[PDB]
Design an enzyme around this catalytic site. Structure first.
Site, mmCIF file in Angstrom:
data_model
loop_
_atom_site.group_PDB
_atom_site.id
_atom_site.type_symbol
_atom_site.label_atom_id
_atom_site.label_comp_id
_atom_site.label_asym_id
_atom_site.label_seq_id
_atom_site.Cartn_x
_atom_site.Cartn_y
_atom_site.Cartn_z
ATOM 1 N N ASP A 54 0.723 -1.357 -0.003
ATOM 2 C CA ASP A 54 0.172 -0.009 0.103
ATOM 3 C C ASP A 54 0.731 1.394 -0.038
ATOM 4 O O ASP A 54 0.418 2.455 -0.486
ATOM 5 C CB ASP A 54 -1.135 -0.076 0.974
ATOM 6 C CG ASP A 54 -0.558 -0.191 2.694
ATOM 7 O OD1 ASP A 54 0.765 -0.307 2.673
ATOM 8 O OD2 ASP A 54 -1.573 -0.132 3.395
ATOM 9 N N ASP B 55 5.107 1.085 13.448
ATOM 10 C CA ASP B 55 4.586 -0.229 13.393
ATOM 11 C C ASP B 55 5.267 -1.208 14.217
ATOM 12 O O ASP B 55 4.640 -2.200 15.014
ATOM 13 C CB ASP B 55 3.914 -0.666 12.354
ATOM 14 C CG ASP B 55 2.818 0.052 11.648
ATOM 15 O OD1 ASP B 55 2.142 0.869 12.442
ATOM 16 O OD2 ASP B 55 2.713 -0.041 10.231
#
Ligand SMILES: [Cl-]
Ligand SMILES: [Cl-]
Ligand SMILES: [Mg+2]
Length: 748
Positions: free
Chosen positions: A38, A446
């Site tokens: 993405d 993350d």
């Protein structure tokens, strides 16, 4: 515009570290596989090395949205050809996407602009396939678009595109309908040809399309897309995620009450027998036993009565993969409950290629598996030339197996990390210490960040105590580099005692949390922001995200508000004088000579202020660092064109004044590394535009001249994230990215 040849390589994570919404096997050439991300472009598999090769590193500064890969198609007639639909949604006017085409398996690309936006970053990005090549006449492609743009088609191998005006339903579902400027239709969900209805060189006549409209979601054409009908008998109420036509004639469709990749609390799986017209509900679970969408869907081409689906998302205790060898008539789960809380498993996880995927939680229990099977499992694929191979994407990696059929005979399926070569992290900071065993510590979104002795080895250790998702700042004491401090965003709903700051006195190998954090009244900081560590390690300056700038001279046993510096300021420590810190905000430079307790604004003029037109605080591009070994030597890069304050500035008097380098027309980041042999000043590394050329540059003469050290094939999109040299390796650069991980490069 002199350049020097460099070898560019990835700092390894083993697992990639981000979301892989699509894996695409070619249907005619064994071992030809692509993966799309993405935020970080696409990849092509190399069977000989069991690893992936980026096909996106030529994407650069201006065309960065090409790394938002919303769809990808690989041509089954001419397998050298591959295409992608790329772009992201932003706030900008005219930020449209493009269809990219390659005739050499992604080594080189050409691009055609579309007149509308592509949403490689938007919900539903794992639905598909939304870009498809006609398997009989490969000059025909179709693209199912977002936002009401409907169905589009090319008949010239992707060079020109036009709307299919007869397509009757552009979509009705919107993930966030009352949201301000998020009023966007999801649009079309997938396209699938029936290859039996064409012949080589002649257009395939029967085409199926799934649409994000719960009242009417499945359409068919029997005339090559000239006209369309909603299929009789189809189910209503849910949103299709994937549609796969088995060679048996059964069209399988997974459904969810969301489009993904996070939302999905109910779902169904159906099949349509395309010969008889009969629909059957083959959902593996239903009612209160189903609390998740069905996402991934795969049919085994070699054994086309075999179908698998994944949950999207079950969350607890883990996701589920379901396998049927009888067309959905019955299903086997990859794990089952035993005597509660115990579970039985048909799989074993192997994370030796990225051991940090256990998150530093070594004991794997039934209700808290570590590593988990996955999450955000929007795409699941079976190799069409090998029923024993499956791959799937998660929010962190690509997993796969080479013994899938052991499921059917009672053996355990071995699931391993299958993301060698993928690097998808966003880099928020980089430090290269001047002594000790590590050459680099990263601060990542993350997955927190990692410490490297060997840049080619996948990290063994996840950063814990504290453990969090995203490290927003990291620094070390220049004259005591075993002392390292990182800040981030602790998730206090999951662990109320977790702190948003971690301290190490062993170079970042082991961390601990201090006894307090900055507070104001009844509010304790949520953390994040930036951190600077004094040269001795005796003071920590924390520019928190929410309460402003605080300092501690008590190792975090207490925190005191810093006077004289605005909340949100950028902060940096002097690398020599432990009492000297610097700050910057809104065009004002500040200095402290009391260890961060008090700051004064200097007379420094001309630095960018980020306060004109519409500019927002998240837009501010600022890179400020003091030089090791020289008190009061400070470099500043950043700014923007709207203020006409963009470039590289240097102070030699602790920020009292800065001089703008006249030979650098724009610059975004600055960093330092070992001096060149024969030179007396550390080498400089910058992300900049030099006489019209965007790239990465080195100066060995304190900025008097520059040499380009990247090249057009190694650009890595919008590289405005982090840069540093290595104080112990001349010529080495470490470059952060937003979706390609961290690179390191050295002169040839
Ligand atoms: Cl895709
Ligand atoms: Cl999705
Ligand atoms: Mg797929």
């Amino acid at each position: 515009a002199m350049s020097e040849a460099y070898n560019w390589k990835s700092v390894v994570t083993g697992a990639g570290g981000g979301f892989v919404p699509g894996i695409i096997f070619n249907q005619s050439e064994p071992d030809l596989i692509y993966a799309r991300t993405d935020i970080g472009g696409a990849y092509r598999w190399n069977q000989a090395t069991g690893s992936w090769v980026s096909i996106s590193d030529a994407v650069g500064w201006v065309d960065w949205n090409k790394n938002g890969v919303d769809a990808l198609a690989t041509d089954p007639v001419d397998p050298d050809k591959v295409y992608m639909a790329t772009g992201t949604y932003t706030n900008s006017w005219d930020d449209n996407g493009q269809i990219m085409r390659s005739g050499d398996r992604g080594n080189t690309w050409q691009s055609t602009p579309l007149p509308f936006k592509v949403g490689g970053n938007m919900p539903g990005r794992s639905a598909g396939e939304r870009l498809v090549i006609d398997p009989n006449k490969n000059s025909i492609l179709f693209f199912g678009a977002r936002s009401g743009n409907g169905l589009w088609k090319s008949t010239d191998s992707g060079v020109t595109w036009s709307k299919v005006s007869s397509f009757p339903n552009v979509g009705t579902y919107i993930q966030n309908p009352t949201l301000e400027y998020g009023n966007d239709l999801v649009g079309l969900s997938w396209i699938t040809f029936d290859p039996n209805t064409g012949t080589p060189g002649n257009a395939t006549q029967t085409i199926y399309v799934g649409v994000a409209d719960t009242a009417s979601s499945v359409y068919r054409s029997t005339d090559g897309g000239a006209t369309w009908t909603a299929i009789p008998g189809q189910p209503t109420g849910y949103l299709p995620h994937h549609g796969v036509l088995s060679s048996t004639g059964d069209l399988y469709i997974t459904y969810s009450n969301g489009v993904g990749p996070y939302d999905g609390s109910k779902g169904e799986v159906w099949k349509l027998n395309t010969a008889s017209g009969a629909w059957t509900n083959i959902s593996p679970s239903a009612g209160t036993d189903n609390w998740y969408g069905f996402g991934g869907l795969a049919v085994d081409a070699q054994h086309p009565d075999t179908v698998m689906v994944s949950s999207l998302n079950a969350w607890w205790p883990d996701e589920v993969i379901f396998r049927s060898t009888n067309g959905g008539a019955t299903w086997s789960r990859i794990w089952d409950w035993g005597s509660y809380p115990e579970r039985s498993y048909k799989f074993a996880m192997d994370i030796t290629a990225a051991p940090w995927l256990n998150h530093g939680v070594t004991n794997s229990t039934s209700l808290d598996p570590s590593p988990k099977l996955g999450w955000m499992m929007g795409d699941l694929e079976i190799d069409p030339f090998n029923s024993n191979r499956m791959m799937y994407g998660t929010g962190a990696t690509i997993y796969g197996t080479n013994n899938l059929t052991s499921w059917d005979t009672g053996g355990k399926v071995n699931i391993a990390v299958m993301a060698k070569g993928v690097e998808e992290t966003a880099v928020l900071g980089l430090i290269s210490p001047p002594s000790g065993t590590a050459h680099l510590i990263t601060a990542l979104g993350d997955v927190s960040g990692f410490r490297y002795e060997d840049l080619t080895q996948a990290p063994v250790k996840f950063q814990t105590s504290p453990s969090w998702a995203t490290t927003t700042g990291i620094d070390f004491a220049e004259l005591n580099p075993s002392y390292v401090v990182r800040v981030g965003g602790a998730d206090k709903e999951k662990d109320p005692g977790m702190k948003s700051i971690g301290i190490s006195n062993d170079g970042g190998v082991n961390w601990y949390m201090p006894n307090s954090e900055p507070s104001s009244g009844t509010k304790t900081t949520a953390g994040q922001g930036q951190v600077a560590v004094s040269a001795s390690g005796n003071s920590i300056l924390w520019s928190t995200s929410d309460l402003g700038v605080y300092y501690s001279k008590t190792t975090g046993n207490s925190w005191t508000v810093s006077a004289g510096v605005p909340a949100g300021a950028k902060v940096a420590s002097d690398r020599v004088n432990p009492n000297k810190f610097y700050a910057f905000y809104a065009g004002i430079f500040y200095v402290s000579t009391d260890g961060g307790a008090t700051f004064t604004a200097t007379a420094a003029a001309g630095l960018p202020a980020n306060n004109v037109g519409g500019l927002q605080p998240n837009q501010a591009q600022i890179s400020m660092k003091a030089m090791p070994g020289i008190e009061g030597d400070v470099w500043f890069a950043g700014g923007n064109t709207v203020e006409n304050k963009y470039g590289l500035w240097h102070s030699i008097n602790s920020g009292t004044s800065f001089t703008k380098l006249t030979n650098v027309e724009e610059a975004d980041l600055i960093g330092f590394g070992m001096a060149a042999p024969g030179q007396n000043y550390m080498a400089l590394y910058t992300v900049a535009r030099m006489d019209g050329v965007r790239g990465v540059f080195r100066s060995d003469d304190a900025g008097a001249s520059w040499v380009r050290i990247n090249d057009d094939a190694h650009q890595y999109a919008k590289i405005n994230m982090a840069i540093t040299g290595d104080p112990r390796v001349y010529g080495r650069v470490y470059l952060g990215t937003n979706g390609r991980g961290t690179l390191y490069a050295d002169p040839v």
